[PDB]
Enzyme design. Structure first.
Site, PDB file in Angstrom:
ATOM      1  N   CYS B 106      16.234   3.502  16.503  1.00 51.90           N
ATOM      2  CA  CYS B 106      14.949   3.949  17.027  1.00 51.90           C
ATOM      3  C   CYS B 106      14.434   2.930  18.034  1.00 51.90           C
ATOM      4  O   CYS B 106      14.238   1.764  17.691  1.00 51.90           O
ATOM      5  CB  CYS B 106      13.926   4.140  15.901  1.00 51.90           C
ATOM      6  N   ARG B 109      10.049   1.653  17.826  1.00 52.80           N
ATOM      7  CA  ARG B 109       9.532   0.969  16.640  1.00 52.80           C
ATOM      8  C   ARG B 109       8.429  -0.029  16.934  1.00 52.80           C
ATOM      9  O   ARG B 109       7.922  -0.634  15.985  1.00 52.80           O
ATOM     10  CB  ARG B 109      10.666   0.240  15.891  1.00 52.80           C
ATOM     11  N   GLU B 283      15.636  11.927  26.336  1.00 50.32           N
ATOM     12  CA  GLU B 283      16.146  12.827  25.304  1.00 50.32           C
ATOM     13  C   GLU B 283      16.136  14.255  25.801  1.00 50.32           C
ATOM     14  O   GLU B 283      17.093  15.010  25.576  1.00 50.32           O
ATOM     15  CB  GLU B 283      15.323  12.724  24.017  1.00 50.32           C
TER      16      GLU B 283
HETATM   17  C1  HEM Z   1       6.464   7.281  18.805  1.00 46.68           C
HETATM   18  C2  HEM Z   1       7.499   7.531  19.615  1.00 46.68           C
HETATM   19  C3  HEM Z   1       8.980   7.509  19.154  1.00 46.68           C
HETATM   20  C4  HEM Z   1       9.966   7.438  20.031  1.00 46.68           C
HETATM   21  C5  HEM Z   1       9.762   7.342  21.555  1.00 46.68           C
HETATM   22  C6  HEM Z   1      11.230   7.444  19.319  1.00 46.68           C
HETATM   23  C7  HEM Z   1      12.473   7.385  19.909  1.00 46.68           C
HETATM   24  C8  HEM Z   1      13.710   7.526  19.293  1.00 46.68           C
HETATM   25  C9  HEM Z   1      14.994   7.747  19.954  1.00 46.68           C
HETATM   26  C10 HEM Z   1      15.201   7.889  21.476  1.00 46.68           C
HETATM   27  C11 HEM Z   1      15.939   7.807  19.001  1.00 46.68           C
HETATM   28  C12 HEM Z   1      17.443   8.053  19.224  1.00 46.68           C
HETATM   29  C13 HEM Z   1      17.532   9.564  19.454  1.00 46.68           C
HETATM   30  C14 HEM Z   1      18.840  10.007  20.060  1.00 46.68           C
HETATM   31  O1  HEM Z   1      19.783  10.277  19.288  1.00 46.68           O
HETATM   32  O2  HEM Z   1      18.949  10.121  21.307  1.00 46.68           O
HETATM   33  C15 HEM Z   1      15.293   7.637  17.714  1.00 46.68           C
HETATM   34  C16 HEM Z   1      15.899   7.645  16.483  1.00 46.68           C
HETATM   35  C17 HEM Z   1      15.250   7.559  15.268  1.00 46.68           C
HETATM   36  N1  HEM Z   1      13.884   7.419  15.083  1.00 46.68           N
HETATM   37 FE1  HEM Z   1      12.457   7.099  16.563  1.00 46.68          FE
HETATM   38  N2  HEM Z   1      10.956   7.521  17.964  1.00 46.68           N
HETATM   39  C18 HEM Z   1       9.576   7.578  17.812  1.00 46.68           C
HETATM   40  C19 HEM Z   1       8.944   7.682  16.586  1.00 46.68           C
HETATM   41  C20 HEM Z   1       9.584   7.639  15.345  1.00 46.68           C
HETATM   42  C21 HEM Z   1       8.972   7.804  14.032  1.00 46.68           C
HETATM   43  C22 HEM Z   1       7.472   8.075  13.805  1.00 46.68           C
HETATM   44  C23 HEM Z   1       9.931   7.692  13.097  1.00 46.68           C
HETATM   45  C24 HEM Z   1       9.834   7.760  11.551  1.00 46.68           C
HETATM   46  C25 HEM Z   1       8.711   7.490  10.877  1.00 46.68           C
HETATM   47  C26 HEM Z   1      11.182   7.431  13.770  1.00 46.68           C
HETATM   48  C27 HEM Z   1      12.404   7.255  13.131  1.00 46.68           C
HETATM   49  C28 HEM Z   1      13.641   7.377  13.722  1.00 46.68           C
HETATM   50  C29 HEM Z   1      14.914   7.473  13.041  1.00 46.68           C
HETATM   51  C30 HEM Z   1      15.109   7.462  11.512  1.00 46.68           C
HETATM   52  C31 HEM Z   1      15.870   7.591  13.960  1.00 46.68           C
HETATM   53  C32 HEM Z   1      17.377   7.705  13.685  1.00 46.68           C
HETATM   54  C33 HEM Z   1      17.787   6.241  13.530  1.00 46.68           C
HETATM   55  C34 HEM Z   1      18.961   6.031  12.614  1.00 46.68           C
HETATM   56  O3  HEM Z   1      19.608   7.027  12.199  1.00 46.68           O
HETATM   57  O4  HEM Z   1      19.249   4.850  12.300  1.00 46.68           O
HETATM   58  N3  HEM Z   1      10.930   7.425  15.128  1.00 46.68           N
HETATM   59  N4  HEM Z   1      13.944   7.465  17.937  1.00 46.68           N
HETATM   60  C1  LIG Z   2      22.669  11.598  14.685  1.00 46.06           C
HETATM   61  C2  LIG Z   2      21.644  12.685  14.886  1.00 46.06           C
HETATM   62  O1  LIG Z   2      21.069  12.542  16.179  1.00 46.06           O
HETATM   63  C3  LIG Z   2      19.742  12.250  16.281  1.00 46.06           C
HETATM   64  C4  LIG Z   2      19.178  11.423  15.328  1.00 46.06           C
HETATM   65  C5  LIG Z   2      17.834  11.099  15.400  1.00 46.06           C
HETATM   66  C6  LIG Z   2      17.050  11.633  16.406  1.00 46.06           C
HETATM   67  C7  LIG Z   2      15.592  11.266  16.482  1.00 46.06           C
HETATM   68  C8  LIG Z   2      14.803  11.206  15.335  1.00 46.06           C
HETATM   69  C9  LIG Z   2      13.420  11.102  15.434  1.00 46.06           C
HETATM   70  C10 LIG Z   2      12.844  10.997  16.696  1.00 46.06           C
HETATM   71  C11 LIG Z   2      11.378  10.861  16.843  1.00 46.06           C
HETATM   72  C12 LIG Z   2      10.506  10.844  15.616  1.00 46.06           C
HETATM   73  C13 LIG Z   2      10.858  10.763  18.136  1.00 46.06           C
HETATM   74  C14 LIG Z   2      11.718  10.783  19.244  1.00 46.06           C
HETATM   75  N1  LIG Z   2      11.208  10.693  20.501  1.00 46.06           N
HETATM   76  N2  LIG Z   2      13.059  10.925  19.083  1.00 46.06           N
HETATM   77  C15 LIG Z   2      13.623  11.028  17.849  1.00 46.06           C
HETATM   78  C16 LIG Z   2      14.999  11.151  17.731  1.00 46.06           C
HETATM   79  C17 LIG Z   2      17.621  12.451  17.363  1.00 46.06           C
HETATM   80  C18 LIG Z   2      18.971  12.771  17.306  1.00 46.06           C
HETATM   81  C19 LIG Z   2      19.568  13.683  18.367  1.00 46.06           C
HETATM   82  N3  LIG Z   2      20.916  13.225  18.772  1.00 46.06           N
HETATM   83 CL   LIG Z   3      15.338  16.537  20.480  1.00 46.14          CL
END
Ligand code: HEM
Ligand SMILES: CCOc1ccc(-c2ccc3c(C)cc(N)nc3c2)cc1CN
Ligand SMILES: [Cl-]
Ligand code: HEM
Ligand SMILES: CCOc1ccc(-c2ccc3c(C)cc(N)nc3c2)cc1CN
Ligand SMILES: C[C@H](O)[C@H](O)[C@H]1CNc2nc(N)[nH]c(=O)c2N1
Ligand SMILES: C[C@H](O)[C@H](O)[C@H]1CNc2nc(N)[nH]c(=O)c2N1
Ligand SMILES: [Cl-]
Ligand SMILES: [Gd]
Ligand SMILES: [Gd]
Ligand SMILES: [Zn+2]
EC number: 1.14.13.39
Lengths: 400, 402
Positions: B106, B109, B283
Site C-alpha cells: 500500500c 499508508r 490504478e
Molecule cells: C487513502 C488512499 C489510498 C491509496 C491511494 C491506496 C493505494 C493503494 C495501491 C495503489 C495499492 C496497490 C494496488 C495495485 O495492485 O495496483 C494498495 C494496496 C493495498 N492497500 Fe492501499 N490505498 C489507500 C487506502 C487504503 C486503506 C484505507 C486500506 C485499509 C484500511 C488500504 C489497504 C491496502 C491493502 C491491504 C493493500 C494490498 C496490500 C497487500 O496485499 O500487502 N489502503 N493501496
Molecule cells: C493482488 C490483488 O490485487 C490488488 C490488491 C489490492 C488492491 C487495493 C486494495 C485497496 C485499495 C484502496 C483501499 C485504495 C486504493 N486506491 N487502491 C487499493 C488497491 C488492488 C489490487 C488490484 N490489482
Molecule cells: Cl480498482
C-alpha cells in the site's frame, strides 16, 4: 518447484532450474531483500561442476574426452593449486555467465557473443591495446556486436588485473565551489582519481574520462582514449527543433569494466563486456535520474509544460520526448539501439526458450521491467524467480 | 545483523531493525527469491493474542501496567472457557489501523492514522450486512470528498459459518463473456458476473454495468442485493484537450472499496471487513483501462491520437498511456472527486517511510507494488531500497468462497 504465473495470458509454468541454485542470495523466510542493489579444495568442486556443464551442452556426457578432461584439471590443481580453461570452455563459460545474469533483459542474444582471449596479457600497455581492439570491434562503425575480453585469471602470491573505470566510456563529473556537479555525478569519484593521477581536466558536461588500467601489483596508469575510437551520438528530436541546442550527447558503447567473471571456480577480475543500449537506459536513467544529469525539468520548461503541479504529468511527458529523441538520434546515426518494448518482448521469447531448454530462467523482476512504462510491457505481468547459477558475473569491491 | 537499506537518489543509509520482529514467514529462501509472486490450537491463538495485547498497551503507554496484566489474564481465561475471545472496541480500532500500517503493498499508508472504523460485529443477517455496507459507501464517498473507512463484521468463530462478501470490491463493473470468446465490460469480473446471473441477477449488456452485491450470512447461501444507483458515484472520463476522448464513453467509479480480504487481529480473523480509500490515478488510467487483459483501450486511443502504431520505437504506447492518465486526473478533478497522482502519492510514501523509521525502526514495503506502473524511476520510491516482510495485525488474501 515454484509455480510461476503470467497474468496477461493466464499460463502457468514451473521453474525446476531454481532447484539447482548455488551461491545463496539475500532473502530469508522472515524478510525479502530482492530490491537491494548490492545484497582451498573447494576449487575442484566448482571445476568439476563446470566441466560437467560443458560436456552436457555438446551432446557428449559420459565418454572419452569428458572422462579425460576431468582428470587433467584434477592433476593441474593437484600440481599447481589452480587450473587453465580450454579455449572453448572459456567461450562456453562467458556465454553461460551472460545467460545466467538475472538482471539482464537482453539475454535473447546470449548465444551470439565474441570472446577475445587476453589471458596472456602481461602489462598495462598490453591491456590498453586489448581494450582498444574490443572497443573497435564492438563499435564497428555503429553496427554494435556483443563482445567480452577476458584478461588473466587471478592467482595467489601476485596481484590482479583491474579496470578502475566502471565502464570503458564514462563522462567526467566535476565538483564545484558549491558542491554541485558539471558533468555526470555518477563518475565524480573516478574523475578525482584521474586528475589525481595526471589527467588535465576538461571544462564540460560530456568530457570522456581517461582509462585507469592496473597491471598486477603496479600502480594504475592513465590512458587517453583515441577520439575516433569513442563513437558518440548528439541528441536531437524529430520535431522539437530546440532539443539539439541543449547540447546533449551519449556514447554508443555500453561496456562494463568493473565486474568479475567467475567461471568454474576461476575468477577474472578484469573481463570487460559490451552489448548495445536499450533506449531507456540512456533516456530515463542516465539523463533524467535526479542524481544523474537530472535534465527533466529543463526539457519541460522548453516544452512549456505546467511544472507547477505534479498532476499535469509534466515529468511523464518530458520523459517520453527525451526517450523519443534518444531512439531518433541513434537511428539517424546508424547506431544499434533497442526500445524497451522491443527489448521486453524479446525477453518474453527468451523465457519461453529457456523454459523448454533448461526448465526455467533466473530473472530479477525489478531490473527486467523497464523504468518507464513498466505495465505497458509484457514482463510486468510475468511472475519471475530469482536465483544464482554458475558461471556468473559478480560485483567486486573497487580497487581502492 | 539488520538489513542495510540505501536510497540511491540521496545516498541515505538506514537499517531496518523492525524486520527482525517479522511475525510470520514469506515465500523467499536463500536459494530463490519469489518477491514478485502475486500470491505467495489454543496455545497459538494465545501467543498471537498475547503479542497484540502487548502492542496495544504499548501504543497507549501502559505496557506492563495493572490494566495490561489484567487484559492478558482476561484473554487467557476466555480462550480456556470458550476457545476464542472478544476484542474491546478500542483494541479493534487500533488493530484495524495497524493492519493498514502493516500492508506492504500500500502506497497510501501516510494516512494510516486517519481511518474511520465502523464496528458491525453485532451484525445478524445478510440484510443487516447490506445496510452497514450502504452506510459505509455513503460515509466514504461523502459527495466526492472521499474518506478512508473500514466496516468490520463478526469474527470467525467455532460453531458458525463466516460472514463473506463474495464481490472482490463493493463497486465493480460486470464482465460478460460472449462469443466470439471475448468479454464485454471488465474481464477481471467474469466469474463474479456469472455468479450474480446464476443467483437471480438480470444482466445488462453495457461496458460499465455496476454489479450487485452477493452477501453471505453464516450457514446461508449468498443473497443478492442491488446497490441503490444514487449511492454509486461515477466519473465520466474526458480529456482537457483531446475532445474526441469523451466520445469513447469511458467511466470509472469514485470509491475503491476492497471487500474480499481477511483482517487478522491478535489471532482473530474477520473474513468480512471491507475497507476503502481513494484512487491513485494510475490504478484507473494504466492498470484498469490499459492492461491487455482488462479494458485494453491503449491501441484505440493511440490510433485516435494519430500516433504511428506500426512500430514500437515511436513510443506510441507510452504517449497514449500518458494522455489516458491525464484524462483520469482531469476528469476526477472536474467532478470534485478525490484522486492522487503517482508523483504526489510516492512523495508522501517517502515521508511515511521516514516517519516509520523514527517510530518503529523500519517499514515493510514491497518495492514492485510501491513503484507505480508508469514513470517508475521518475518517482522517488524507485531509488529507495526496501525490505518486505509480514507483520500482524494484517490484511490477508483468502480463497474465493465458491
Ligand atoms: C487513502 C488512499 C489510498 C491509496 C491511494 C491506496 C493505494 C493503494 C495501491 C495503489 C495499492 C496497490 C494496488 C495495485 O495492485 O495496483 C494498495 C494496496 C493495498 N492497500 Fe492501499 N490505498 C489507500 C487506502 C487504503 C486503506 C484505507 C486500506 C485499509 C484500511 C488500504 C489497504 C491496502 C491493502 C491491504 C493493500 C494490498 C496490500 C497487500 O496485499 O500487502 N489502503 N493501496
Ligand atoms: C493482488 C490483488 O490485487 C490488488 C490488491 C489490492 C488492491 C487495493 C486494495 C485497496 C485499495 C484502496 C483501499 C485504495 C486504493 N486506491 N487502491 C487499493 C488497491 C488492488 C489490487 C488490484 N490489482
Ligand atoms: Cl480498482
Ligand atoms: C546485447 C544487448 C544487451 C542489452 C540490451 C542489455 C541490457 C541490460 C540492462 C538494461 C541491464 C540492467 C542493468 C541495470 O539497469 O541496473 C543489464 C544488466 C546486465 N547485463 Fe545485459 N545487455 C546486453 C548485453 C549484455 C552482454 C553482452 C553481457 C555480458 C556478456 C551482459 C551482461 C549483463 C550483466 C552481468 C548485467 C547485470 C546482471 C546482474 O547484476 O544480475 N549484457 N543489461
Ligand atoms: C547495479 C549497478 O548498476 C548497473 C549494473 C549493470 C549495468 C549494466 C551492465 C551491462 C550492460 C550491457 C552490456 C548493455 C546494456 N545495454 N546495459 C548494461 C547495463 C548497469 C548498471 C546501471 N544501474
Ligand atoms: C507479476 C507481477 O509481480 C504482478 O503483475 C504485479 C507487479 N506489480 C504490481 N504493482 C501494483 N501496484 N499492482 C499490481 O497489480 C502489480 N502486479
Ligand atoms: C532502489 C532500487 O532497488 C534501485 O533503484 C534499483 C531498482 N531497479 C533498477 N532498475 C534498473 N533498470 N536500473 C537500476 O539501477 C535499478 N536500481
Ligand atoms: Cl549507462
Ligand atoms: Gd518559446
Ligand atoms: Gd483539441
Ligand atoms: Zn526475495
Amino acid at each position: 518447484f515454484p509455480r510461476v504465473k503470467n497474468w496477461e495470458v493466464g499460463s502457468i509454468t514451473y521453474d525446476t532450474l531454481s532447484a539447482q541454485a548455488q551461491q545463496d542470495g539475500p532473502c530469508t523466510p522472515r524478510r525479502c531483500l530482492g530490491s537491494l542493489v548490492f545484497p582451498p579444495e573447494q576449487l575442484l568442486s566448482q571445476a568439476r561442476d563446470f566441466i560437467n556443464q560443458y560436456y552436457s551442452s555438446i551432446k557428449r556426457s559420459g565418454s572419452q574426452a569428458h572422462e579425460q578432461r576431468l582428470q587433467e584439471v584434477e592433476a593441474e590443481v593437484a600440481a599447481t593449486g589452480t587450473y587453465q580453461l580450454r579455449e572453448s570452455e572459456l567461450v562456453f563459460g562467458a556465454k553461460q555467465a551472460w545467460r545466467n545474469a538475472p538482471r539482464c533483459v537482453g539475454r535473447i542474444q546470449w548465444g551470439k557473443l565474441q570472446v577475445f582471449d587476453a589471458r596472456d596479457c602481461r602489462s598495462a600497455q598490453e591491456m590498453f591495446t586489448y581494450i582498444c581492439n574490443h572497443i573497435k570491434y564492438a563499435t564497428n562503425r555503429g553496427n554494435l556486436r556483443s563482445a567480452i575480453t577476458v584478461f588473466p585469471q587471478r592467482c595467489p602470491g601476485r596481484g590482479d588485473f583491474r579496470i578502475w573505470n566502471s565502464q570503458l566510456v564514462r563522462y567526467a563529473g566535476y565538483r564545484q565551489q558549491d558542491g554541485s556537479v558539471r558533468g555526470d555525478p555518477a563518475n565524480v569519484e573516478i574523475t578525482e582519481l584521474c586528475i589525481q593521477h595526471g589527467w588535465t581536466p576538461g571544462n564540460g558536461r560530456f568530457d570522456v574520462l581517461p582509462l585507469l588500467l592496473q597491471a598486477p601489483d603496479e600502480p594504475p596508469e592513465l590512458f587517453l582514449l583515441p577520439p575516433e575510437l569513442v563513437l558518440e551520438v548528439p541528441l536531437e528530436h524529430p520535431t522539437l527543433e530546440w532539443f539539439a541546442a541543449l547540447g546533449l550527447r551519449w556514447y554508443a558503447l555500453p561496456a562494463v569494466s568493473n565486474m568479475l567473471l567467475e567461471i568454474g571456480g576461476l575468477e577474472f577480475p578484469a573481463a570487460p563486456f559490451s552489448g548495445w543500449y536499450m533506449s531507456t537506459e540512456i533516456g530515463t536513467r542516465n539523463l533524467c535520474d535526479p542524481h544523474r544529469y537530472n535534465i527533466l525539468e529543463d526539457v519541460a520548461v522548453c516544452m512549456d509544460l505546467d511544472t507547477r503541479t505534479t498532476s499535469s504529468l509534466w515529468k511523464d511527458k518530458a520523459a517520453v520526448e527525451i526517450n523519443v529523441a534518444v531512439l531518433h538520434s541513434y537511428q539517424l546515426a546508424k547506431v544499434t539501439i533497442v526500445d524497451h518494448h522491443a527489448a521486453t518482448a524479446s525477453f518474453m521469447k527468451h523465457l519461453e526458450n529457456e523454459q523448454k531448454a533448461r526448465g526455467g530462467c533466473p530473472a530479477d523482476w525489478a531490473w527486467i521491467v523497464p523504468p518507464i512504462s513498466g505495465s505497458l510491457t509484457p514482463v510486468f505481468h510475468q511472475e519471475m524467480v530469482n536465483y544464482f547459477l554458475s558461471p556468473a558475473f559478480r560485483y567486486q569491491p573497487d580497487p581502492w
